[PDB]
Amino acid sequence: HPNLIVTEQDVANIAASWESYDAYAEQLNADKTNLDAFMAEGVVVPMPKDAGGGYTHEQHKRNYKAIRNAGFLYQVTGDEKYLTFAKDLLLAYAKMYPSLGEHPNRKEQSPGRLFWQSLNEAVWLVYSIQGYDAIIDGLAAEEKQEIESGVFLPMAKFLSVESPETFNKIHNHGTWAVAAVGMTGYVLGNDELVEISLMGLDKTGKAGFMKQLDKLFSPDGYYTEGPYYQRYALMPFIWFAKAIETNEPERKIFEYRNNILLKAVYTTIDLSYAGYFFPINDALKDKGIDTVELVHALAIVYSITGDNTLLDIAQEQGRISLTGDGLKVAKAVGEGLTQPYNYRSILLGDGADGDQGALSIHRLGEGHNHMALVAKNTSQGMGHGHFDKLNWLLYDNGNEIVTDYGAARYLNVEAKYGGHYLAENNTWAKQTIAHNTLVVNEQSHFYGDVTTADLHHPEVLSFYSGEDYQLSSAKEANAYDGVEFVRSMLLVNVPSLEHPIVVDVLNVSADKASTFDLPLYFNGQIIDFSFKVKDNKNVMKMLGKRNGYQHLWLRNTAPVGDASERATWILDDRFYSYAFVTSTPSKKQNVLIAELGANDPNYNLRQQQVLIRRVEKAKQASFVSVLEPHGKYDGSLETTSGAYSNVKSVKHVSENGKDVVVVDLKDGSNVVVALSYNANSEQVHKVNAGEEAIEWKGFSSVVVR
Amino acid sequence: HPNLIVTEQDVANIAASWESYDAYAEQLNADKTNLDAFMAEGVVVPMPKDAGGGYTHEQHKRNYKAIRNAGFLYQVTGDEKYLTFAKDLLLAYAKMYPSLGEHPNRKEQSPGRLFWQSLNEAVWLVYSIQGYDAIIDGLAAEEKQEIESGVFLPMAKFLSVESPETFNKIHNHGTWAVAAVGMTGYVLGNDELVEISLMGLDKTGKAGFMKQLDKLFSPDGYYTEGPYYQRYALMPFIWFAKAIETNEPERKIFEYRNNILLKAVYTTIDLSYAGYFFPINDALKDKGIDTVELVHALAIVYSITGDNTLLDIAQEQGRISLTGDGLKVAKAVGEGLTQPYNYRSILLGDGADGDQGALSIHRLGEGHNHMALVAKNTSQGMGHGHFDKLNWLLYDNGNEIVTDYGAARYLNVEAKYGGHYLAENNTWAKQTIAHNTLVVNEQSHFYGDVTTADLHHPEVLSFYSGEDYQLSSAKEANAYDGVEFVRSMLLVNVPSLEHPIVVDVLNVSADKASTFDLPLYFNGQIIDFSFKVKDNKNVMKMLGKRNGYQHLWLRNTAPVGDASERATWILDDRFYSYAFVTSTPSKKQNVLIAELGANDPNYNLRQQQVLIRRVEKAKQASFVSVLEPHGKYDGSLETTSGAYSNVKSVKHVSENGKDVVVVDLKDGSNVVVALSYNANSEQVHKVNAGEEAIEWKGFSSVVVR
Ligand SMILES: [Zn+2]
Ligand SMILES: [Zn+2]
Numbered sequence A, B: 001h002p003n004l005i006v007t008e009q010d011v012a013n014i015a016a017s018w019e020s021y022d023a024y025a026e027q028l029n030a031d032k033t034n035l036d037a038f039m040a041e042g043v044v045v046p047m048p049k050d051a052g053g054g055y056t057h058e059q060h061k062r063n064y065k066a067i068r069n070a071g072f073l074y075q076v077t078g079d080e081k082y083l084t085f086a087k088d089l090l091l092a093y094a095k096m097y098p099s100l101g102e103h104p105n106r107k108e109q110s111p112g113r114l115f116w117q118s119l120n121e122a123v124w125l126v127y128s129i130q131g132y133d134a135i136i137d138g139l140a141a142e143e144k145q146e147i148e149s150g151v152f153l154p155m156a157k158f159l160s161v162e163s164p165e166t167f168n169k170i171h172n173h174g175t176w177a178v179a180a181v182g183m184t185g186y187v188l189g190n191d192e193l194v195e196i197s198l199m200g201l202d203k204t205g206k207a208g209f210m211k212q213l214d215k216l217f218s219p220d221g222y223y224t225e226g227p228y229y230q231r232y233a234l235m236p237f238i239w240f241a242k243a244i245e246t247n248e249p250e251r252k253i254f255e256y257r258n259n260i261l262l263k264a265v266y267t268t269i270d271l272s273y274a275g276y277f278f279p280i281n282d283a284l285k286d287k288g289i290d291t292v293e294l295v296h297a298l299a300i301v302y303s304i305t306g307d308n309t310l311l312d313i314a315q316e317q318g319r320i321s322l323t324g325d326g327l328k329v330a331k332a333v334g335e336g337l338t339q340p341y342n343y344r345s346i347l348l349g350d351g352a353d354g355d356q357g358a359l360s361i362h363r364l365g366e367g368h369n370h371m372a373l374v375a376k377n378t379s380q381g382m383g384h385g386h387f388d389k390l391n392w393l394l395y396d397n398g399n400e401i402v403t404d405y406g407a408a409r410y411l412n413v414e415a416k417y418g419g420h421y422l423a424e425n426n427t428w429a430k431q432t433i434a435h436n437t438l439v440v441n442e443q444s445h446f447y448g449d450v451t452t453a454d455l456h457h458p459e460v461l462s463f464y465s466g467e468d469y470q471l472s473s474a475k476e477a478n479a480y481d482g483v484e485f486v487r488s489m490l491l492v493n494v495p496s497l498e499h500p501i502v503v504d505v506l507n508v509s510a511d512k513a514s515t516f517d518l519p520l521y522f523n524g525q526i527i528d529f530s531f532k533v534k535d536n537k538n539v540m541k542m543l544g545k546r547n548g549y550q551h552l553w554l555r556n557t558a559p560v561g562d563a564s565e566r567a568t569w570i571l572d573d574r575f576y577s578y579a580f581v582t583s584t585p586s587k588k589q590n591v592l593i594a595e596l597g598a599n600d601p602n603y604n605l606r607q608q609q610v611l612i613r614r615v616e617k618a619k620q621a622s623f624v625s626v627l628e629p630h631g632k633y634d635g636s637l638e639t640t641s642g643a644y645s646n647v648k649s650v651k652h653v654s655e656n657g658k659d660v661v662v663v664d665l666k667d668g669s670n671v672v673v674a675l676s677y678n679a680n681s682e683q684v685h686k687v688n689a690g691e692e693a694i695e696w697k698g699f700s701s702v703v704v705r
Helices: A008-022 A022-039 A055-077 A080-099 A118-138 A141-159 A174-186 A192-200 A209-215 A227-247 A256-270 A292-305 A309-315 A324-334 A423-429 B008-017 B022-039 B055-077 B080-099 B118-138 B141-159 B171-189 B191-200 B208-213 B227-247 B256-270 B292-305 B310-317 B324-334 B423-429
Strands: A346-349 A357-364 A371-378 A391-396 A399-402 A461-467 A469-476 A481-494 A501-521 A523-531 A541-543 A552-559 A566-572 A574-583 A589-596 A607-629 A632-634 A639-641 A649-656 A658-665 A670-675 A682-686 A693-697 A700-704 B348-349 B357-364 B371-378 B390-396 B399-402 B459-465 B470-474 B483-492 B502-519 B525-529 B539-542 B551-559 B567-570 B574-583 B587-598 B609-630 B632-635 B639-641 B647-655 B660-666 B670-675 B684-689 B692-697 B700-704
Touching: A008 A022, A008 A055, A008 A324, A022 A055, A022 A080, A022 A324, A055 A080, A055 A118, A055 A357, A080 A118, A080 A141, A118 A141, A118 A174, A118 A227, A141 A174, A141 A292, A141 A700, A174 A192, A174 A209, A174 B502, A192 A658, A209 A256, A227 A256, A227 A292, A227 B423, A256 A292, A256 A346, A292 A309, A292 A324, A324 B670, A357 A461, A357 A469, A357 A481, A371 A469, A371 A481, A461 A481, A469 A700, A481 A670, A481 A700, A501 A649, A501 A658, A501 A670, A574 A632, A574 A649, A607 A649, A607 A658, A639 B055, A639 B348, A649 A682, A658 A682, A670 A693, A693 A700, B008 B055, B008 B324, B022 B080, B022 B324, B055 B080, B055 B118, B080 B118, B080 B141, B118 B141, B118 B171, B118 B227, B141 B171, B171 B191, B171 B227, B191 B208, B208 B256, B227 B256, B227 B292, B256 B348, B256 B551, B292 B310, B292 B324, B310 B324, B357 B459, B357 B470, B357 B483, B371 B470, B371 B483, B390 B574, B399 B609, B459 B483, B470 B700, B483 B670, B483 B700, B502 B647, B502 B660, B502 B670, B574 B632, B574 B647, B609 B647, B609 B660, B647 B684, B660 B684, B670 B692, B692 B700
Parallel strands: none
Antiparallel strands: A346 A357, A357 A371, A371 A391, A391 A399, A461 A469, A469 A481, A481 A501, A501 A607, A523 A566, A541 A552, A541 B539, A552 A589, A566 A574, A574 A607, A589 A607, A632 A639, A649 A658, A658 A670, A670 A700, A682 A693, B348 B357, B357 B371, B371 B390, B390 B399, B459 B470, B470 B483, B483 B502, B502 B609, B525 B567, B539 B551, B551 B587, B567 B574, B574 B609, B587 B609, B632 B639, B647 B660, B660 B670, B670 B700, B684 B692
């Protein structure tokens, strides 16, 4: 002891070297200073009372961190006051815990005892067992027995054999529970606790850690619940793996499933822009790469791989793991070994086998010209999944541009329903209308039914990443009865333009005449539109009755027709223009400008604007658009250039199920995008625009004339 | 030549030493790189066509900066290329200018010839004359004759003798015009142009530069139009003064009126929080200390004073004046002479003699995250003035908390009405309802009439800045017929609380039963209210018909009573709680939660929420409130503490025109604020707060029990 997340050898390395690396010493000293301050308050272990973000919730959180940190500092410094504090905290828990029943402020989740839900109980155990592992050799036998019998063994039993609905779950709850119980198993030398954590309660491998590794990650290391829950589950994954490695290296856990755990870490990094995770599915928008799960995970992977590009990410995190692994990161950074991280375009398969749709990330440019297009062609992702098949997000200039709302939830704010998912998470945040994708008849994909959504996934038709352009194309044939839609999204490098442009082609075919809505949630302030808005007559009414529409105010409608239209907005120092046209036999076309906040008596929803393109009574439609960053606004020096869009118009023609899009530019050049939807790279295609003939080879072609 | 903003000795000093000081070299190289790039485009002088932010507007702007910069670089580096580019630009102007009549894209302002208004013409001249001054050396006689007779002399005459409505103006337009013509006078050796600039067209001193210095600044160096226009006018003030000093040092311009120009520069800095100018009156919210007017002014003042605390601000500006004065700044910064700038509480008198109301800045706390309360008890400030007597702003934690909208205008965005003040600047931004102050009967102060407003100022009753608390108190007797109101605002240090608290007491008395509205414009997301809102029944209607009310949507009304109520919101990592109570005989008390965007078909207004306290059918009211920053939200580490307000309630009693406010805290303690409105330091006062007697001396007292 210790022999878990840190080993005796790690402690020796840290003791010998920590003062020699400034980044590590600064981190250690801050943690030490903060703990010393906390210790001055005495041992404070309150009877459990409060929900998420409430006093007892946050106090028991401060305590598990204190136990872990005191154990670490005892080991590194040899200062007995840290042993005493960790010990006395644990003895207080040991006295209290056997008397605890179900938490009094429970909700619909499995209750904890210390906490309103069992999830936080598992986190408490993951942290606290590390502190115990780090002090155990300095305790009297009676103190060990009291702590083990009073809190650790009863909690481990509670979270495993007493909680099969959680322990056997293939879900982030399951990951945390098996990590907590398995790590306890290693520290206490309890073979049974380790075995059930690895192989499930019945030991057959139908549930447990190994099954989670096999099922929750695709072969690309993409975690099916989405980026936000990927980083969260990454801690119990990487920390239980670390414990397995330090105690049973023969299991070769970091080799398992073609280094799935290593791939999970890189993929977590790859799911961020300007340091923030893509807020698809249930997600909070202030979650970034400095989150401790990725700080610790990066350190472990660096220690294994020696990949010096990880040191770039480490510096961007501005935080370092206080482990033996973190020491290696700090040392490498201090020795000037840092290399730039290779942010790249990727296709991430979803489902265990990678075939259940995919998440595409398309990147182009560098610095403030770095654009990222996210194409959400993924399976449901279980309960946290949103009803947004073929959704997209755009990032540019260090900003989110075309956005995903994330979840309706205020992390650890007790006055917001104990920090838990709000009523509006289901009624607004999960719904299709809340997203940048097709809504049919004001109904959500799969009619907002998670059971149905869980059974289906989009079909990826094409992925391409070149220096000329980037493309993803996917088909959704199961979202609605008698409806199929296909979306192709492109990032195009036009040499004459300062920034890459997005081209979007969303085709829908329906058996019955329908309403088709396509929203665009934008970040910024409207400059102007090419269309005239109808007078709202000094009233804003709720947009629709159900499925998220009840949360939107209609601010203006504007009629549109055959010709492409334009909306231009500003965000910080850059302009963005949305040029759009919809090919359809229906003449009933309108733009709806809407604002979030209807049916929100509790002020749970943020202010937000949206441009919705609506076609009514149509069986067929091709929603075509361009998203173009342009120009410079400098409010400091008081200059402006390039403020007008460089796109004169967008035109579209379909022939024999093949599409041609022509983007006419103000300098007289044009961009031609052609889509055949045929994967045969050698098949030649022809489409007649008017008298103009367009010919190409393969699924797609982009030509700048 | 040059002998204006730089001298021949300055040029020698720069050439000899610019490479030695990193800060100067970085700036010069960045300017040189940008100019070299601009020169590669050739000499481009278009005919005047476009409004503000349009192509010709921004091109003529790039040209005047190029003229100045090429002139400077020719002096410092010697290269013929810089001489020729400045000369060729000026010759193109000389050939075009005599042919120009009124700009074709003029608006209501005095038209320019090069520009849509004459203001920009003046800026062009201020910059361009410096370039000419610096290239005199390498010019032939016929070239000087062409330049002076073709552009400079016609432009100088246009802006002066031909434009009495601007040249005689005691206003920032006047300052820019006299600086432009006066600087031209010095460069051309034209005594007449200098005299009329200093003393006005008729030379009596009724108007012109000297009058502006005596009337537009208070003795404290506060510029009556407000912070945003203070920094703007600061350029022509400080640069014309620089020109006067280098040509006629016997005038002792920097000693004039007890060093008024020096005080003006310090006051400009004192009018910012976290580097941004308080957005009172017409103002844009992205304007900060790195604005070039303050960069140049700071350099001038440092050269005169040697005040090393100005180097702190210089570093925060992140740019350096490319002048001899700027060289001194760079040298001192390189030598490690920087001392921290002393941000402090200040009372700034308004009016020529500082007796026409005042602007109070109250600061408490350390670092760049301290608290700043601004009490706007100032006179009108002419046309750019807002109808917001006794308004207030609050800053905390690097953020604006309780806000001022500034102006409805998009700087140099041509698609937004040529970057000019929008229709909504008058109809929304200037109106009282748009501010954090009293609105009577849905009408603005002075019934929104600038002529009436210009004739009156609030009466300042008290100013105090201590370690215990801070206070401003002011009376507005002239805003409405038969109405008087008084506002006292305090910043209170309560040792048991983590942050100072604001206490607000706004008393109103009216001859007739009236509606009293008190808005609070806040920055952040509502957490919860202590009160119940009425169902809005899925519609938002325009709040009122006139005077800014037509721009607000009513989202919810909520009835309130005798007991204090609370609104709590979150912004970044901190919570803010607004506890409020109104003593009034009227029972008609409601909170209106409103959102901006009605009567805004062009999407000129930002999204914004407001909490308005309304009292109806009342002749008297005391609007009492507490603004309390509290707690910590960490979205990265996922922790929260102190999320609930520590204020249990707020109570108020009035006795013989004297107020007592009791702030009951959750720990059982209380804060007692007493106000007598009697300036006599030794006068004893007594108020019976129920079964309690409150006794104190002086205008105010604050006691923590
Ligand atoms: Zn979503
Ligand atoms: Zn204002």
